[PDB]
């Protein structure tokens, strides 16, 4: 008996991938107005933010200025790692000396990454982020495991990115405090194009949460967020926080200079895997200038608070139990 | 066992949302020609219209001129509430003194809305419309309940908007005469975008009717109507009347001045939740000038009468029992 | 238990509608080359054509010139009825006197149509076509029934259009020799838009054939044919012949003058329900000039012969037993 | 009981067709980095390539220059047959004398093709490719069978193209060393348009592999490849090698001259069934100039190596066991 899509193997095409556009949040009974909502959520197992938003570790998104402004908004910024260890560790100190704010930093795998991690820890970093494209590799799982063995008492360790239930479960057993989710959904991403590899984030979050939540490990949604509604959809899918890159790249606190071409205003926004950021799995694009960060954060949270009012969710942990309605291509 | 879209929860993604474009009306045996059709239907439990159409309570759609012309066409207009109570109540009297025509008015929740409601009732209004974005909030359900307790004998009370079966059922038990349906499908709406919250109207109507019809409570379809066919689809989905905003905003009887820019003619059409109508959940757009109201109403009903001829529906109550055929994205 | 698309009624949304773009013909074992294929098929129960194509009864498609050229190509033309009976009957004689060619003519319902039918029969017409938008009306079923009772011995009677199994079955019992299928799929059609009524033709043909074929009554596919592949898809869906309008409107043998505007060449093509052809259910559009008819027919049949080579179909009656593969929106 | 898409026959619409855009590769546990991957795979039952890529047998894609450069890159080129046998056989010798490189050549069916095949074999060709549009014809199956009987000991025989399980199974029993798959998915192809015949390649590969792999016969994916990800998707679907035409037509080693029109650079790329290549089942289009071949091959393989890193596939034979996730139209 042939499978209705080809072959005799039902599990060849495992499941159906849903993205942010595929779904909409169902309104339920509510005692919650946007004003009274509690947007506080867990970034890690130890760290709680007033705003469940994080800025991406990219050289056109998050450094000193951004990382500080993000913390003061209630969230947190993660410093990118496309620069000498000495300066990145220096930026950590600049943030921490601005009022003891929360800050994160990105590291890869290997000796260079390990050395970098130690300097960051000494610099007083709060969260180390093992930044890889495919965290289901056994090298990444070891990088997380040993880091947690050495500095796990005073520093939080986060692994990513994953897109499957098994990958997230592997990170949990590795000792990760949080599991960042997103393989391919990025705006400047071309992993889906050059490798044909990816997983629609709504399904990706749902699968990852199914492995992390039973272990009490927070999940970070990374990439593919175009609007504030996507943030609410991500958290309702089970995620605890959301990492933004495209939505913050046009802000003034973000790296890259202004672009007054065409009479309009833009800012540079490139993937960390773009040819000019070093087979290129990223592109160097532009994003419309969106003014100060605080203005953008205020409206992203505003839409989030609205969704919590529609779904009758007083807290984020309740919003994570909302229900979706599936949307047909005519939904746009 | 994993759900084919993620997670182990089958009810996480509850149902599949259908919109007007997703469906088409199936032709059946007919003794009905468009000329002999009876378009009369129930707006409320007490009030019946010759034309099952209502103009939206928006400051660019329905005031004195529109509300009068709508009644004379067989339908009814609902006065918006973005203006002093004294003037809105005055517009009610202007309509009622033009031949004892039917008129509706919109109110919110709280003290201001209650005071406004009393002035409108004293002004001789026929239908009070509790105009909210999310009527499943217990504050709205109380606003409807107490209003019906005070002036329910001489004034009809309508609650909205809902998008789910449970929400509509709550409005029925609150004592509502009619339940208006539509969360997100509006043309100038951005609730789906900023909050990620909504429900495709065909499914939204079907679910709401499943709760209202057994209680004998009429259902109003609100928003998402681009063509006259959508009106027929809405009523066939179970709705008794349809509320139009975009289709009437370009009419001469509608507020907002003419726009002769580009050598073409347009009129202002903004959502009541747009930034300039006061986190903005609406936009200020333009719609093509469509001449007098009576001309538009005549052709909307004409398409409605045609659909009643194809489906063999002599009355609207029979049209509500028509069958749909589901359309693939290649349907456009 | 709620239906996954709304309501508690599984039959509210009866079935899923497939159009020509939704499907593709599956290649099978073949002893057939395009050269050796037999494109002959049944227009009616008595009449067989060398080419299973018919030109639409429209005032911008089929009159004297077209009806003659169609017959000489192996097919047949159906004269439209937007003109005095005296002239339409005269055009029948002009065709018949050009070598005893096959010709069809369109009539409506009522006294005028009955009188028209008699003049056409006296003029030596071979096929009378009851041309209506909704042939499931009992007035149409009577028009077919009595016509077949009066002149059924020497003239073939065809009813249309239908889109459902029950409608086609009603036409068969009325005594129809052929059942024309198509409600809404027309290019210049707006029935789907103004009335929200229609049925995707692949499904429409499949349902109609399921009622006609057991009774041995040929089925005509009408409207929605953009390419020659659609012709092969229509016949493989069970149809015996296909009626073309858009594909022949740009031909020189078709009514309407040349349009040299923009430096390109077009011809007038309007629906019989367009405002200028007399609530308008049609539009007045333009189609690219495609030269002589014989050139177009030669290439439409060429693509048809190719499909018969891929599917291993020596005759049209074998092609009607081909299998489809369903195509996702990424199919385009 | 009616089938939800029409008719009473469930097998009328056999299965659902998936293309490259419909699917994405699921990331799994990996010990594989792109550097350590082994891209080697089987072109035929006897011949193994270092790079699983083949250039299409088209007069705008693969001749002497291309066929040589392809072999030196690890793959192989297949010489087209739109030229005298004397010259095509001469091009084989030019390739073989450049270091004993691997080369293929295309033949049709009949006497001319048989004579051509013998000259090619004498010219020292390694792979004969029976190039037809529909290899499920019994004439093609005989052409493959007898060729393998005459020169099967010293020359490999490949049949194509197929799109169904039964067609591929027929080629295997005919004695084919490899089965090329692809009916309709070509970029310059119009078989889907003029004949309405085709089969989405992911499903087409899956069905063909289900018949070939049990017999140990390699499968070639032909046409429909827009990106390097599609190559990884094709092989993961079960294919052993992929035939490229559009991706290599813009290369300098490809036939057709440069096109400096519009200030940009293009090259001629026409189907072998295009009107100017001799009912036309092809078109004469243009493709952007992409520089040398080696540069393109290096990046196609680079994306392939990436996908092998994400899916934990050390070898191509392991990549063939990867799992897909189905993507909704919102996936783009
Ligand atoms: O170059 C790249 N290729 C693929 N993914 C990337 C690349 N650079 C950044 N990303 C991911 O995409 C996210 C940004 O997605 P966005 O917020 O939707 O723009 C980042 O936080 C990374 O997880
Ligand atoms: O600003 C807004 N945000 C969201 N929905 C709105 C807003 N303003 C009006 N609506 C709704 O949208 C309807 C109009 O939809 P339309 O007729 O499709 O233009 C109104 O009757 C309201 O129910
Ligand atoms: O004005 C109209 N409204 C709706 N359908 C029409 C109208 N005029 C013609 N048709 C139908 O559409 C067919 C032509 O479709 P086409 O060949 O796809 O252009 C005709 O043969 C009629 O069946
Ligand atoms: O003219 C044609 N009509 C249909 N298919 C063609 C034609 N010419 C080439 N093809 C096929 O399409 C493939 C190229 O597809 P592409 O690489 O996606 O451009 C070739 O290798 C052939 O299998
Ligand atoms: C190829 C690579 N190795 N290490 C990094 C960092 C990268 S990256 O620059 O390309 N970044 C990302 C980030 C998120 C992703 C999700 N899917 N793919 C991704 C790639
Ligand atoms: C946010 C708000 N509170 N009260 C009102 C009135 C509004 S509104 O201006 O935004 N109007 C609507 C009207 C219909 C809607 C359907 N979904 N969302 C909606 C919003
Ligand atoms: C409204 C009407 N009454 N009689 C005729 C003829 C018409 S028409 O001009 O509009 N023609 C058609 C023809 C085919 C159709 C398929 N669906 N709808 C259709 C309408
Ligand atoms: C019509 C014909 N006969 N022999 C050849 C060669 C051709 S072709 O030039 O058109 N080539 C192809 C090649 C691949 C195809 C996949 N589907 N259809 C195809 C056609």
Short mmCIF file of N, CA and C and ligand atoms in Angstrom, two decimals, chain C residues 310, chain D residues 81 131-134 161 180 182-186 189 191 197 222 271-274 278-279 281-282, ligand 8:
data_model
loop_
_atom_site.label_atom_id
_atom_site.label_comp_id
_atom_site.label_asym_id
_atom_site.label_seq_id
_atom_site.Cartn_x
_atom_site.Cartn_y
_atom_site.Cartn_z
N UNK C 310 0.94 10.03 -23.31
CA UNK C 310 1.50 9.86 -21.98
C UNK C 310 0.68 8.89 -21.14
N UNK D 81 21.94 15.16 -28.34
CA UNK D 81 21.85 14.45 -29.60
C UNK D 81 21.15 15.25 -30.69
N UNK D 131 17.24 8.86 -24.22
CA UNK D 131 16.58 10.11 -23.87
C UNK D 131 15.20 10.24 -24.51
N UNK D 132 14.16 9.96 -23.73
CA UNK D 132 12.78 10.13 -24.19
C UNK D 132 11.95 10.89 -23.16
N UNK D 133 10.80 11.39 -23.59
CA UNK D 133 9.90 12.13 -22.72
C UNK D 133 9.01 11.19 -21.91
N UNK D 134 8.80 10.00 -22.45
CA UNK D 134 7.89 9.03 -21.84
C UNK D 134 8.43 7.62 -22.03
N UNK D 161 12.49 9.33 -19.46
CA UNK D 161 12.24 9.54 -18.04
C UNK D 161 10.95 8.88 -17.57
N UNK D 180 16.26 7.35 -14.84
CA UNK D 180 16.15 8.80 -14.71
C UNK D 180 14.70 9.20 -14.50
N UNK D 182 11.66 12.19 -13.94
CA UNK D 182 11.22 13.56 -14.15
C UNK D 182 10.35 13.72 -15.38
N UNK D 183 9.05 13.84 -15.17
CA UNK D 183 8.12 14.11 -16.26
C UNK D 183 7.36 15.40 -15.97
N UNK D 184 7.80 16.49 -16.57
CA UNK D 184 7.19 17.79 -16.33
C UNK D 184 7.83 18.83 -15.41
N UNK D 185 8.79 18.44 -14.55
CA UNK D 185 9.17 19.47 -13.57
C UNK D 185 10.18 20.48 -14.10
N UNK D 186 10.63 20.31 -15.33
CA UNK D 186 11.64 21.17 -15.92
C UNK D 186 11.26 22.64 -15.91
N UNK D 189 10.18 23.54 -19.21
CA UNK D 189 9.19 22.53 -19.59
C UNK D 189 7.78 23.10 -19.62
N UNK D 191 5.20 20.62 -20.54
CA UNK D 191 4.43 19.39 -20.63
C UNK D 191 3.22 19.45 -19.71
N UNK D 197 0.03 16.95 -18.23
CA UNK D 197 0.63 15.71 -17.74
C UNK D 197 1.91 16.00 -16.97
N UNK D 222 15.85 14.39 -12.39
CA UNK D 222 16.03 15.24 -13.56
C UNK D 222 15.00 16.37 -13.65
N UNK D 271 14.72 24.39 -24.15
CA UNK D 271 14.39 22.98 -24.03
C UNK D 271 14.62 22.28 -25.35
N UNK D 272 14.84 20.97 -25.29
CA UNK D 272 15.06 20.18 -26.50
C UNK D 272 13.75 20.00 -27.27
N UNK D 273 12.64 20.35 -26.63
CA UNK D 273 11.34 20.27 -27.25
C UNK D 273 10.78 21.64 -27.60
N UNK D 274 11.65 22.65 -27.61
CA UNK D 274 11.24 24.00 -27.99
C UNK D 274 11.18 24.12 -29.51
N UNK D 278 14.30 22.43 -33.10
CA UNK D 278 14.08 21.46 -34.17
C UNK D 278 14.30 22.10 -35.54
N UNK D 279 4.22 19.83 -31.97
CA UNK D 279 3.72 20.67 -30.89
C UNK D 279 4.82 20.92 -29.86
N UNK D 281 6.88 21.45 -26.76
CA UNK D 281 6.73 21.20 -25.33
C UNK D 281 7.88 21.84 -24.56
N UNK D 282 8.48 22.86 -25.16
CA UNK D 282 9.59 23.57 -24.54
C UNK D 282 9.65 25.03 -24.97
C1 LIG E 8 8.93 15.38 -26.71
C2 LIG E 8 10.26 14.68 -26.66
N1 LIG E 8 10.53 13.46 -27.20
N2 LIG E 8 11.88 13.13 -26.95
C3 LIG E 8 12.46 14.13 -26.26
C4 LIG E 8 13.90 14.17 -25.81
C5 LIG E 8 11.46 15.07 -26.08
S1 LIG E 8 11.74 16.50 -25.28
O1 LIG E 8 12.64 17.31 -26.12
O2 LIG E 8 10.51 17.31 -25.06
N3 LIG E 8 12.46 16.19 -23.97
C6 LIG E 8 11.92 15.96 -22.74
C7 LIG E 8 12.80 15.68 -21.69
C8 LIG E 8 12.32 15.44 -20.41
C9 LIG E 8 10.95 15.49 -20.18
C10 LIG E 8 10.28 15.28 -18.93
N4 LIG E 8 8.97 15.44 -19.26
N5 LIG E 8 8.85 15.73 -20.64
C11 LIG E 8 10.08 15.77 -21.21
C12 LIG E 8 10.55 16.00 -22.49
#
